[PDB]
Amino acid sequence: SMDFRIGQGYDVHQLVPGRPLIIGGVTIPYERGLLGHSDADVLLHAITDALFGAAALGDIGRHFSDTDPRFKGADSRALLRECASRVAQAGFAIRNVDSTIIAQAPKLAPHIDAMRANIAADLDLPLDRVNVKAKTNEKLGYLGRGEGIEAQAAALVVRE
Amino acid sequence: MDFRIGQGYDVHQLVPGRPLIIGGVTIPYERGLLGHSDADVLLHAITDALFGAAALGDIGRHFSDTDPRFKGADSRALLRECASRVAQAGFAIRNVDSTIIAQAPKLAPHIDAMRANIAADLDLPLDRVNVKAKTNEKLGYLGRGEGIEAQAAALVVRE
Amino acid sequence: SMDFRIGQGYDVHQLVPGRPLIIGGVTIPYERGLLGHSDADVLLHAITDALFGAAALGDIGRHFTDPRFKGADSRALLRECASRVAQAGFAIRNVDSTIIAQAPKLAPHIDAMRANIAADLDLPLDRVNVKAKTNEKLGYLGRGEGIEAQAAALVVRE
Ligand SMILES: CCOc1ccc2nc(S(N)(=O)=O)sc2c1
Ligand SMILES: [Zn+2]
Numbered sequence: 372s373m374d375f376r377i378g379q380g381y382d383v384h385q386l387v388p389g390r391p392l393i394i395g396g397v398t399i400p401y402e403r404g405l406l407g408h409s410d411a412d413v414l415l416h417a418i419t420d421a422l423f424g425a426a427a428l429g430d431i432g433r434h435f436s437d438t439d440p441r442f443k444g445a446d447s448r449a450l451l452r453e454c455a456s457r458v459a460q461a462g463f464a465i466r467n468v469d470s471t472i473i474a475q476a477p478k479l480a481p482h483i484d485a486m487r488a489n490i491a492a493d494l495d496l497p498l499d500r501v502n503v504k505a506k507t508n509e510k511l512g513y514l515g516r517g518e519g520i521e522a523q524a525a526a527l528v529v530r531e
Numbered sequence: 532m533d534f535r536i537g538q539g540y541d542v543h544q545l546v547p548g549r550p551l552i553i554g555g556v557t558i559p560y561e562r563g564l565l566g567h568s569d570a571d572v573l574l575h576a577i578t579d580a581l582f583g584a585a586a587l588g589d590i591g592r593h594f595s596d597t598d599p600r601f602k603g604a605d606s607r608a609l610l611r612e613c614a615s616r617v618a619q620a621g622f623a624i625r626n627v628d629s630t631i632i633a634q635a636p637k638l639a640p641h642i643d644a645m646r647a648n649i650a651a652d653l654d655l656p657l658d659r660v661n662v663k664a665k666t667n668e669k670l671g672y673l674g675r676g677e678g679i680e681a682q683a684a685a686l687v688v689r690e
Numbered sequence: 691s692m693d694f695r696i697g698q699g700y701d702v703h704q705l706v707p708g709r710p711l712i713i714g715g716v717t718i719p720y721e722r723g724l725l726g727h728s729d730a731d732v733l734l735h736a737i738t739d740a741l742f743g744a745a746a747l748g749d750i751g752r753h754f755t756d757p758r759f760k761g762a763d764s765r766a767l768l769r770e771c772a773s774r775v776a777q778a779g780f781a782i783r784n785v786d787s788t789i790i791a792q793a794p795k796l797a798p799h800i801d802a803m804r805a806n807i808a809a810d811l812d813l814p815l816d817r818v819n820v821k822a823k824t825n826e827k828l829g830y831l832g833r834g835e836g837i838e839a840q841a842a843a844l845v846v847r848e
């Protein structure tokens with residue numbers, strides 16, 4: 372009950388016109404969307420990587436391949452749920468997740484509760500163990516120019 | 532045994548005509564950080580880590596850029612109120628770690644003072660607070676000195 | 691026992707011609723390598739900073755002109771870092787990390803990096819993790835101008 376481990380996750384996707392904007396499982400109206408072979412859900416990908424990392428199971432690319440017919444059409448919530456199943460099977464219980472989305476636009480505050488609810492459901496966690504934060508990049512860099520969106524995640528687990 | 536972790540990120544532009552305040556320390560420099568508050572990028576990152584570890588949202592939720600209450604605000608006062616709310620939520624802080632990334636000025640002479648400020652504001656001994664500082668090895672807008680970034684991690688426990 | 695602490699680390703180095711690419715102690719075939727005073731192993735630097743941070747010992751810049759470390763490679767420095775963490779009364783519980791590089795492919799080398807780090811930190815493999823991804827062609831990382839590493843470390847004061 373004291374074998375705690377920490378994991379950390381990072382992801383980024385390009386933001387361009389012509390695709391939907393989906394973050395934390397939430398479709399957000401915007402003139403641009405994230406590019407990636409999946410649904411490009413940068414927040415769920417970062418959290419997934421933090422969870423695999425806390426369990427020392429490698430990373431999201433080692434677990435899911437575009438070539439794998441099991442996951443070919445899978446959205447990022449299905450990937451997060453499978454991640455959590457593998458983390459549990461390796462012997463770990465998740466204690467909490469925290470995260471940050473960095474986007475110059477749109478405003479993400481109205482969507483935070485919905486994202487937290489999706490993530491908590493997918494991880495079978497109480498809502499008060501899941502946190503999502505959001506901020507701009509103060510107009511600096513490709514993030515500040517609206518050319519991508521970044522997500523960071525931290526996860527604490529314990530080996531039971 | 533109810534431990535929780537949080538992580539924080541912040542960045543502010545470096546501009547002429549502003550005080551440079553990082554970790555609560557007013558640093559002599561021809562430029563300063565631009566923000567609604569005093570724009571203390573390090574304290575904001577730590578504030579976000581603490582709110583995040585307690586699942587209390589983020590700094591924008593508690594101390595909005597849009598609220599005139601916080602124009603020019605002392606970010607140490609914001610950090611102390613953050614810590615008060617984290618305590619009110621049932622959490623004790625176990626440690627904080629952080630990094631400042633900047634091309635200039637030299638931060639080594641100021642790091643110990645930043646650590647002491649953060650420790651005081653969080654009611655922690657110095658040995659549970661850590662401030663790291665580095666350059667971005669000449670890359671990107673940080674390499675060009677256009678802003679300063681801070682990162683933070685916080686461990687809390689629900690008592 | 692229960693005095694846990696967390697640390698976090700970040701580093702980035704430029705990719706330059708005429709130098710070997712060494713990440714996680716692994717020499718990787720590539721026409722460029724990382725620039726730095728050391729061998730510029732950006733992954734070991736990030737982990738080193740996370741460990742110093744978790745133990746509240748400052749940072750890599752304060753720890754490392756010293757004739758003990760003049761020509762030291764990054765694994766010797768990681769080992770010395772781990773010594774100083776132990777000196778302060780801390781035991782390492784786990785390390786996690788991410789390498790961000792547009793090229794070359796790091797997947798074939800990850801297992802060796804983890805084994806190198808585990809040996810240097812005197813940890814079992816199941817307490818060390820290395821992740822790797824691209825930057826989706828964004829920014830200086832996406833243009834192949836540098837490689838970034840991030841790390842998180844958990845320690846306990848015994
Ligand atoms: C079936 C889906 O398989 C994959 C494979 C790689 C992969 N990488 C990411 S990332 N680098 O976090 O944008 S999400 C993803 C999904
Ligand atoms: Zn992704």
Ligand SMILES: [Zn+2]
Binds near residue numbers: 542543566571572
């Ligand atoms: Zn700020």
Ligand SMILES: [Zn+2]
Binds near residue numbers: 726731
């Ligand atoms: Zn370095």
